Amino acid sequence: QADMIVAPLTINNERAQYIEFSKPFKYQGLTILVKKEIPRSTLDSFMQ
């Protein structure tokens, strides 16, 4: 049904068996994100 894939597509050994990948747009890995804690920031007051 298709002749070319144009979308974010990583590269790995299993997928490289059956198709070609040319050369990258841009280089990036992968990380983790968690919620911020800035609600629990260091506040201030006169009496502190």
């Binding site: 590269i11 990948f21 050369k23 990258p24 280089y27």
Partner: protein
């Protein structure tokens, strides 16, 4: 003292061409105790008159693992004509210069990929960003 500098040969016997710079490839002089490269090193000649030398580094560590899995042989030798390679009057020198002239058949080390150099040789997937 042997009449032959190197043993005569008897496509799994491939030639490689390398350049020396950065932690990627490091050149060190031979041990004077025995005149051989020590542990964790790959032999590498050097033209100009042939002198033995020891080559080691990060990039060479790749060439050990790749050649072991695909099961082929090699024998490195450093280049003796200029830097990585520059076109002058439609001629190629350096590491690129050897591969186009079929005297090398493969170059490893620290090359940089761009459009001009893909009109003569072919690269593979990059293994470090630059």
């Amino acid at each position: 003292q042997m009449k032959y500098y190197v043993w005569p040969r008897m496509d799994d016997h491939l030639s490689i061409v390398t350049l020396e710079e950065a932690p990627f490839v490091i050149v060190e002089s031979v041990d004077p105790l025995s005149g051989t490269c020590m542990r964790n090193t790959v032999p590498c000649q050097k033209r100009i008159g042939y002198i033995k030398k020891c080559c080691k580094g990060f990039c060479i560590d790749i060439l050990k693992k790749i050649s072991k899995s695909v099961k082929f042989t090699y024998d490195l030798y450093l280049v003796t004509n200029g830097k990585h390679g520059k076109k002058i009057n439609g001629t190629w020198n350096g590491m690129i210069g050897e591969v186009v002239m079929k005297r090398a058949y493969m170059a490893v080390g620290s090359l940089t990929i761009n459009e001009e150099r893909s009109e003569v040789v072919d690269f593979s997937v990059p293994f470090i960003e630059t």
